Curated annotation (Swiss-Prot):
Protein name: Leaf-branch compost cutinase
Keywords assigned by UniProt, alphabetized: Disulfide bond, Hydrolase, Secreted, Serine esterase, Signal
Organism (species): Unknown prokaryotic organism
Biotechnology usage: The engineered enzyme with mutations Ile-208/Cys-203/Cys-248/Gly-92 can hydrolyze PET in a highly efficient way, ultimately achieving, in less than 10 hours, a minimum of 90 per cent PET depolymerization into monomers, with a productivity of 16.7 grams of terephthalate per liter per hour. It was also shown that biologically recycled PET produced from enzymatically depolymerized PET waste exhibits the same properties as petrochemical PET, before being processed into bottles, thereby contributing towards the concept of a circular PET economy.
Cysteine pairs bridged by disulfides in the record: C240-C257
């Protein structure tokens, strides 16, 4: 009945590992594009289906490889994921927003045929690590068509974003680079009260927790993307009535659960 629904009924165990789909990659060379530094597209193969798309940005001084595990994890659960490299490794968060915007336009207008055949360009979301997550919040403000945004241990000097795009922010308790008291939590609190939003804080986690395989990040990022990109309400169970011992803070206005 939901034409965008993919994969068997989820289990928490299943969302901590690569999913039902084989994954291929397409390397986007830096010279092949303008507006961002190229990157890697992870996309499902062995299938004739189409899937929503996600543009993902790494953080300060980092490249696409720092989120390669997450790009492949999301792809394997049924998404087309472009993890970008930036024009300069020292680009700030608003620059990363512009480069996410170029990456989304590339997906919708300049995709390789192998990517486009697996892509429903009408259903796009964004995600990002650190300054990349700052850029995710800025692009959510500009582009109301986005289905979801997931900033991972985000960093931004701007603390105030206006968007109706549903936002789930992942904070890291022990983050000294983007302390949650100065970034993640102000971001959550200053988002509109009418916008479906969730803040989770991983116990004992560091700023680099998003840069390698992480069960909690996998569960919440897949579930948020499934819920909003696919309208797949089967993933409400992991985001609602939440009792998760991996988490040491949880905040929501609960607008995503019905
Ligand atoms: O995106 C990241 O992971 C990230 C974000 C911020 C810093 C940082 O040191 O902020 C202080 C200095 C600002 C520019 O020098 C480092 C890394
Ligand atoms: Ca602002």
């Amino acid at each position: 009945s939901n034409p965008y629904q993919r994969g068997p009924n989820p289990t928490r165990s299943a969302l901590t590992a690569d999913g039902p789909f084989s994954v291929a990659t397409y390397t986007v060379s830096r010279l092949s594009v303008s507006g961002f530094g190229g990157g890697v597209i992870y996309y499902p193969t062995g299938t004739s289906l189409t899937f929503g798309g996600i543009a993902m940005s790494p953080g300060y001084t980092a490249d696409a490889s720092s989120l390669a595990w997450l790009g492949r994890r999301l792809a394997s659960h049924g998404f087309v994921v472009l993890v970008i490299n930036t024009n300069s490794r020292f680009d700030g968060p608003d620059s990363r927003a512009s480069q996410l915007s170029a990456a989304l336009n590339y997906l919708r207008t300049s995709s390789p045929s192998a990517v486009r055949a697996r892509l429903d360009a009408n259903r796009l979301a964004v995600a990002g690590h650190a300054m990349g997550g700052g850029g995710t919040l800025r692009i959510a403000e500009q582009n109301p068509s986005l289905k979801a945004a997931v900033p991972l241990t985000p960093w931004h000097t701007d603390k105030t974003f206006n968007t109706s795009v549903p936002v789930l922010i992942v904070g890291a308790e022990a983050d000294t680079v983007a302390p949650v008291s100065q970034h993640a939590i102000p971001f959550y609190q200053n988002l509109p009260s009418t916008t479906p939003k969730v803040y989770v804080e991983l116990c004992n986690a560091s700023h680099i927790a998003p840069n390698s395989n992480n069960a909690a990040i996998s569960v919440y990022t897949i579930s948020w993307m499934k819920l909003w990109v696919d309208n797949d309400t089967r993933y409400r169970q992991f985001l609602c009535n939440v009792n998760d011992p991996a988490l040491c803070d949880f905040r929501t206005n609960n607008r995503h659960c019905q």
